[PDB]
Amino acid sequence: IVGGRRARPHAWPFMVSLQLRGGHFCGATLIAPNFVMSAAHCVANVNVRAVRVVLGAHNLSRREPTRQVFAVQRIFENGYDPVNLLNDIVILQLNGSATINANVQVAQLPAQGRRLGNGVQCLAMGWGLLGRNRGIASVLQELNVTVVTSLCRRSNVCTLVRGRQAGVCFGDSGSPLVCNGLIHGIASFVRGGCASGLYPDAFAPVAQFVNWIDSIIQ
Numbered sequence: 001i002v003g004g005r006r007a008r009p010h011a012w013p014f015m016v017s018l019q020l021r022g023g024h025f026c027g028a029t030l031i032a033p034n035f036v037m038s039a040a041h042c043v044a045n046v047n048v049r050a051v052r053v054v055l056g057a058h059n060l061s062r063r064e065p066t067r068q069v070f071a072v073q074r075i076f077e078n079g080y081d082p083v084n085l086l087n088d089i090v091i092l093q094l095n096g097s098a099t100i101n102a103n104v105q106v107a108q109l110p111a112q113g114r115r116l117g118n119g120v121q122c123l124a125m126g127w128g129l130l131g132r133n134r135g136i137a138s139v140l141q142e143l144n145v146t147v148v149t150s151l152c153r154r155s156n157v158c159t160l161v162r163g164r165q166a167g168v169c170f171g172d173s174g175s176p177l178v179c180n181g182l183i184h185g186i187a188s189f190v191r192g193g194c195a196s197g198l199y200p201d202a203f204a205p206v207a208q209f210v211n212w213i214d215s216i217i218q
């Protein structure tokens with residue numbers, strides 16, 4: 001996240017860090033005790049047997065006793081199309097069930113088909129690149145963004161910060177976009193580099209996939 005701020009510790013207890021040997025590579029969202037959802041582009045070229053699903057985290061540089069770590073048992077996809085950048089969603093079934101508590105909670109999802117209007121205020125978040133060549137964040141970042149339909153396809157939810165350069169970046173892939181208390185997006189792609197101040201950030205539109213999500217988480 002470029003131009004955001006540190007989240008309050010454990011403000012977003014559905015927020016997940018996907019990790020490989022020495023560290024974070026993508027975000028995800030806890031959507032049931034034994035399932036997370038992320039971006040398909042996060043895992044397309046990675047050995048899922050090596051992925052660690054880290055719940056309850058805040059500062060990735062510290063040992064945090066709040067964390068719970070799972071492996072991935074199974075992946076469910078929904079027509080990921082990397083050429084057209086469509087259907088950028090994956091569900092990862094965990095090898096066990098999270099212990100739900102103050103620091104680890106299941107996200108709330110929208111109803112199937114619910115679109116967001118121009119001007120909806122959301123929060124993006126993640127442990128991705130901070131901009132100004134600062135690398136991956138240690139402390140979870142959040143960012144106020146606004147939904148836009150301009151320079152966006154109907155197959156995405158897009159967002160833009162106005163009046164300054166700010167937005168999601170590498171390593172924010174797969175992270176939730178929270179709008180009116182519900183997870184409406186999964187970070188998918190940027191144009192113009194991160195935080196261009198021109199192109200909106202694009203998210204997989206969670207509302208388009210809710211019946212599919214529900215069918216899996218049961």
Ligand SMILES: COC(=O)C1=C(C)N(c2cccc(C(F)(F)F)c2)c2n[nH]c(=O)n2[C@@H]1c1ccc(C#N)cc1CC[N+](C)(C)C
Nearest residue numbers: 041082083085086088168169170172173174187188189190
């Ligand atoms: C494997 O791909 C990737 O890791 C791509 C990534 C990481 N990012 C990207 C960059 C900054 C922030 C974010 C974030 F928004 F998710 F946080 C994502 C990206 N931006 N643009 C782009 O093409 N990509 C990548 C990409 C992202 C999403 C989809 C989908 N659907 C497909 C591709 C590949 C597209 N082709 C290059 C094959 C045309």
Ligand SMILES: *[C@@H]1O[C@H](CO[C@@H]2O[C@@H](C)[C@@H](O)[C@@H](O)[C@@H]2O)[C@@H](O)[C@H](O)[C@H]1NC(C)=O
Nearest residue numbers: 120121122123143144145178179180181182
């Ligand atoms: C910045 O964002 C703050 C948090 O946003 C609200 O809560 C999150 C979880 C989402 O549900 C989001 O849709 C909500 O708007 C707001 O408290 C604050 O007012 C925002 N400030 C501005 C100027 O956008």
Ligand SMILES: *[C@@H]1O[C@H](CO)[C@@H](O)[C@H](O)[C@H]1NC(C)=O
Nearest residue numbers: 052069070071072095096097
């Ligand atoms: C799931 O995987 C984690 C991480 O490897 C491990 O610590 C845990 O024991 C596993 N749980 C079950 C129920 O197999």
